[PDB]
Amino acid sequence: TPKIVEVNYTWATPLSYNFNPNMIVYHHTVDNNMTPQKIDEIHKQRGWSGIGYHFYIRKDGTIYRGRPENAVGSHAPGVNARAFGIASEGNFNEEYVTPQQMTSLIALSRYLMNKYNITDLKRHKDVRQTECPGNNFPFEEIKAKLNVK
Ligand SMILES: [Zn+2]
């Protein structure tokens, strides 16, 4: 089972648990050097309860929990009730996922896919107009390693 680091959050507004995931959406953070706590602060400024992603993967491969696994997130308006959101630290218009981020992306994705019977993997740019998760985000390689077509 991948190592998920639990984080102490204080949620500003009520979380909804009317969450029925059938999709994983991949994100980049654009900004580097952010703790999950810093993301949570920014997401609170934007009027969300707190960190909008269900998971945040830092450059050294550490997987932090964001939103509770059974709560609706704030990462992709229009699919939030049906999508896990997985963020990777970086701006992948300008750099590449680290090998440790790739290892964690595959492990976390397969965990969620098996646990929830999910086969639908999407980039944020596949569901909304955005450059996220960045030009160099290795989407086709992730799908290939997970045997998704
Ligand atoms: Zn995004």
Author numbering: 24 to 172
From the paper:
The basic local alignment search tool (BLASTP) sequence-similarity searches for proteins showing homology to eukaryotic peptidoglycan recognition proteins (PGRPs) and thermostable Ph2119 and Ts2631 endolysins allowed to identify in the genome of Clostridium intestinale URNW (accession no APJA01000012.1) an open reading frame (ORF, coordinates 584335-584853 nt) encoding a 172 aa protein (Mr = 20,090; pI = 9.96) with a putative lytic function. Genomic localization of the lysC gene (coordinates 584335–584853 nt), separated by more than 68 kb from the nearest annotated phage gene, indicates that it probably encodes a bacterial autolysin involved in peptidoglycan remodeling rather than a phage lytic enzyme. The Ph2119 endolysin, in turn, was used as a model in molecular replacement to determine the structure of LysC. The overall RMSD is 0.81 Å, comparing 85 aligned Cα atoms. Unlike Ph2119 endolysin, LysC has a large part of the N-terminus not present in the electron density maps (23 amino acids in LysC not visible). Most probably these residues could not be traced due to high mobility-intrinsic disorder. The catalytic site of LysC is composed of His50, His147, and Cys155, a motif also present in Ts2631 and Ph2119 endolysins. Other conserved residues, such as His51, Thr52 (HHT motif), Tyr76 (IGYH motif), and Thr153 (T(X)CPG motif) are close to each other in the potential peptidoglycan binding site and may therefore contribute to the catalytic function. The phosphate group was modeled in two adjacent positions in Ph2119 endolysin as well as in the LysC structure, with occupancies of 0.8 and 0.2. Crystallographic and site-directed mutagenesis studies reveal that the highly positively charged N-terminal region of the protein is the major contributor to the antimicrobial activity of LysC.
The two endolysins under study in our laboratory, Ts2631 and Ph2119, which originate from T. scotoductus bacteriophages, reveal structural features characteristic for type 2 amidases (family: PF01510), with a Zn2+ ion coordinated by two histidines and a cysteine residue. Both these proteins show amino acid sequence and structure similarity to numerous enzymes from mesophilic bacteria, including the LysC lytic enzyme of C. intestinale URNW. In the present work, we determined the crystal structures of Ph2119 endolysin and LysC, both to 1.2 Å resolution. The overall structures of Ph2119 endolysin and LysC show conserved catalytic domain architecture, including the Zn2+ coordination site.
